[PDB]
């Protein structure tokens, strides 16, 4: 289990997806033409996980770029690392999806999906041992949301024994394109609950607040938010991308993080928050990574309990200090970690730090506090759905009201399920 196939879908999917490849290609010393110009051997020992080796000692991202309009993907090709992607893996329709889940899932996306799958199969075929897939997308638009979850469903049919992973950006009125986002996210969450093993919940509310409050950026662009997303993505993929101690893969992560199959929605976080000169002491990293102000999902971890936790430290530091500090928060905040899963916090260290920082920490929590995210979207949904407002956009693409009622129920179930274990 080494190779991963990366898929990025829609405006948001391709934007954050493009930053991920910029960030991680700099860490593995791959330039914008695909040539290695690094210094350590540790940069290339697990390069197979995300890149294929081509003729002339080039590295090509195992990346499939999907959209239902050409705009964003043309920006990616024009952009700084655009030339590194395999040109055959740009798969794109022309008419767009108009921020409509139904267009993505049932009509426009249907027309395009089989050709995405042909590239997925192509990339899969030349993998020695495929461990699974990761998708970058939002749940608030139409392509990444609707088509993205169509793909997920299809990939599960063809590769039922491989791991499905998502970086799923959740919508918020603070960072909002259209009023139908709550509908699009509720239809997608139902898909994610059934058809994925792990989902990183990036809430745009939380990214905005981090940019506003805890970084002093008065007017945040999507690029400012996507700086935070790409840094977290680098964070959570560290163990996959460098050696080593725990032979780290998607399945082992899934087995240990997910005590109940539906509850696989993780609350990622990063320390230190950037946009520095002083390096953080190991106590500070440990305080900050566990701090609400550093979480990428707008939930108070104090309103729930941790089922499982995975913390990944990056840089040259005393592991003695790390273990003491990691034991200090568990023993000083012990009510917030469930007693019925012994030793639920798992710590890992990697010697190489990310660009810019001397040391850093990535947090991955399966907290029952995530319910707040789903309740927030369930309320925004019901506000509109009780008056059947904006439904014509979907019913015009063949969907029934029944399908909305179902998704509403399936999400409120998810919320009940998280509540069961927060009091248990």
């Amino acid at each position: 289990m080494r190779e991963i196939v990366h898929i990025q879908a829609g405006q948001c999917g391709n934007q954050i997806g493009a930053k991920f490849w910029e960030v991680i290609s700099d860490e593995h010393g791959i330039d914008p033409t695909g040539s290695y110009h690094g210094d350590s051997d540790l940069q290339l020992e697990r390069i197979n996980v995300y890149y294929n080796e081509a003729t002339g000692n080039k590295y090509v991202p195992r990346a499939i770029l999907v959209d239902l309009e050409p705009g964003t993907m043309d920006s990616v090709r024009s952009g700084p690392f655009g030339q590194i992607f395999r040109p055959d893996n740009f798969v794109f329709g022309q008419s767009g999806a108009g921020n409509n889940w139904a267009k993505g899932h049932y009509t426009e996306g249907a027309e395009l999906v089989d050709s995405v799958l042909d590239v997925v199969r192509k990339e899969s075929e030349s993998c020695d041992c495929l461990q699974g897939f990761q998708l970058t997308h939002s749940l608030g638009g139409g392509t990444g949301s609707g088509m993205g979850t169509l793909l997920i469903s299809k990939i599960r049919e063809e590769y039922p024994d491989r791991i499905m992973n998502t970086f799923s950006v959740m919508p918020s009125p603070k960072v909002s394109d259209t009023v139908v986002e709550p509908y699009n996210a509720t239809l997608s969450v139902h898909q994610l609950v059934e058809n994925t093993d792990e989902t990183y919940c990036i809430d745009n509310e939380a990214l905005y607040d981090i940019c506003f409050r805890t970084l002093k950026l008065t007017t945040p662009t999507y690029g400012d938010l996507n700086h935070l997303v790409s840094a977290t993505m680098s964070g959570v993929t560290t163990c996959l991308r460098f050696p080593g101690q725990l032979n780290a893969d998607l399945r082992k992560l899934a087995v240990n993080m997910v005590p109940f199959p539906r509850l696989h929605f993780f609350m990622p976080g990063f320390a230190p928050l950037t946009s520095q000169y002083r390096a953080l002491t190991v106590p500070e990293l440990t305080q900050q990574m566990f701090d609400s102000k550093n979480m990428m999902a707008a939930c108070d971890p104090r309103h729930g309990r941790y089922l499982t936790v995975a913390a990944i430290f990056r840089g040259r530091m005393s592991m003695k200090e790390v273990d003491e500090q990691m034991l200090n928060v568990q023993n000083k905040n012990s009510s917030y970690f469930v007693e019925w899963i012994p030793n639920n916090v798992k710590t890992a260290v990697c010697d190489i730090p990310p660009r810019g920082l001397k040391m850093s920490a990535t947090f991955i929590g399966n907290s029952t506090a995530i319910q707040e995210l789903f309740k927030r979207i369930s309320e925004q949904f019901t506000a509109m759905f009780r008056r059947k407002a904006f439904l014509h956009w979907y019913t015009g693409e063949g969907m029934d009201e029944m399908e909305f009622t179902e998704a509403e129920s399936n999400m409120n179930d998810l919320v009940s399920e998280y509540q069961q274990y927060q009091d248990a």
């Binding site: 032979n247 087995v255 109940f260 005393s318 592991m319 019925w340 012994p342 030793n343 798992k346």
Partner: protein, 437 residues
């Protein structure tokens, strides 16, 4: 002589195998290429060391070893490492995909497709043996391969080699050393399924070894290399009597007879002194009294527990170095008066002593200092049930909520196998208490 096959399942098994075979090679004067200059019978023999090594016409000495892992990375470091010429490639067996810390995946799913291959490579070694005793099996309780594939091997080894003895070296899981959350489940499952198939099993709690490395080797944050090098000294002690001239514990059957009167209660507590740092400039060498006395201190045990609140069924003292019988008996006389050493009423209060005059060998550049004399006590105390209770409690906590269970069921395993395995462990805890109070 009678040949012994060592089997190393999983990462923990394999890396501990590496450590042991490195040490054995140093002890018998066998080199990385596999030549043994001090051997005069070229091409063969029936010396005590031949129980663990076969020989070839060109003079190579070859471990009676099978390394089995469901993924290649760890055994690939044996294939490319210091002792690459030592093993025949057919002894080193790897899969493609590990068991993701899942008993069921190791036992049922990925086990089924590889069990026949491994038994075949085991048969290739059993056919080179004039009179096979049986097997030493090394594994973790926590790993999926270590828990799951081991238990299926132990099932099949009972069928194909019903006459032969099976000893375990088992690594019990510890939060302080790369534990996953599901290892308590894995530990109970494999313990249940392996219980009837194992004659004598030596548990090594990673917690105990880790603190020994902190306290006595001054190692801030012990690595697997530190832990394994130390575990292999305890292993060498225990297997010394199979590989060297002597009259205590000369075959695998004797380990069962001397240490295991009640067949289910077959987990002897190992205790080991002295453990001393090679970076320590000034060290006053410890005596026979002081190291025999160190055998009754919990801080030196392979599992932390309190023998004073339990009862002994058997006690062996295996000395390595400058020791003579009268020094041992004088130390035993002193210690009996000071400490609480209660035996069961149906067993003779006593000690079977084994002394080998060659002091312990140390790996050059290792963490352990050379010592004039050392000892490994093997005592079958009921105190070791303390470890079963801890492990059982963690299982109960998670299993009350059905936490993680779906991953096991998803590999074809029935939910009932959990509570079944836990009932055997409930019976096991009760056996210890009857015998012990």
């Amino acid at each position: 002589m009678r040949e012994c096959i060592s089997i190393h399942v999983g990462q923990a098994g394999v890396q501990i195998g590496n450590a042991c075979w490195e040490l054995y090679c140093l002890e018998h004067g066998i080199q990385p290429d596999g030549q043994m200059p001090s051997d005069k019978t070229i091409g063969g023999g029936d010396d005590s060391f031949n129980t663990f090594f076969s020989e070839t016409g060109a003079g190579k000495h070859v471990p009676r070893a099978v390394f089995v892992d469901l993924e290649p990375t760890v055994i690939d470091e044996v294939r490319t490492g210091t002792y690459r010429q030592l093993f025949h490639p057919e002894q080193l067996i790897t899969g493609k995909e590990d068991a993701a810390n899942n008993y069921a995946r190791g036992h049922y799913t990925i086990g089924k497709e590889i069990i026949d291959l491994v038994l075949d490579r085991i048969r290739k070694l059993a056919d080179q043996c004039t009179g096979l005793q049986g097997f030493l099996v090394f594994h973790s309780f926590g790993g999926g391969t270590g828990s799951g594939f081991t238990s299926l091997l132990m099932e099949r080894l009972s069928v194909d080699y019903g006459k032969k003895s099976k000893l375990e070296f088992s690594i019990y899981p510890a939060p302080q050393v790369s534990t996953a959350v599901v290892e308590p489940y894995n530990s109970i499952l494999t313990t249940h399924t392996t219980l009837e198939h194992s004659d004598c099993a030596f548990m090594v709690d990673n917690e105990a070894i880790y603190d020994i490395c902190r306290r006595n080797l001054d190692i801030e944050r012990p690595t697997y290399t530190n832990l394994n090098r130390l575990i292999s000294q305890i292993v060498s002690s225990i297997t010394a009597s199979l590989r060297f001239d002597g009259a205590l514990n000369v075959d695998l059957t004797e380990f069962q007879t001397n240490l295991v009167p009640y067949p289910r209660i077959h987990f002897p507590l190992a205790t080991y002194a002295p453990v001393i740092s090679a970076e320590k400039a000034y060290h006053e060498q410890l005596s026979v009294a002081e190291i025999t006395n160190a055998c009754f201190e919990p801080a030196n045990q392979m599992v932390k527990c309190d023998p004073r609140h339990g009862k002994y069924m058997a006690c062996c003292l295996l000395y390595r170095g400058d020791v003579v019988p009268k020094d041992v008996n004088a130390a035993i006389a002193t210690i009996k008066t000071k400490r609480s050493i209660q035996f069961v009423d149906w067993c003779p209060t006593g000690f079977k002593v084994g002394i080998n005059y060659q002091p312990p060998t140390v790996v050059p550049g290792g963490d352990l200092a050379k010592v004039q004399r050392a000892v490994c006590m093997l005592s079958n105390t009921t105190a070791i049930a303390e470890a079963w209770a801890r492990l059982d409690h963690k299982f109960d906590l998670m299993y009350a909520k059905r936490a993680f269970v779906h991953w096991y069921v998803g590999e074809g395993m029935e939910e009932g196998e959990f509570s079944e395995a836990r009932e055997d462990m409930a019976a096991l805890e009760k056996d210890y208490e009857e015998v012990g109070v």
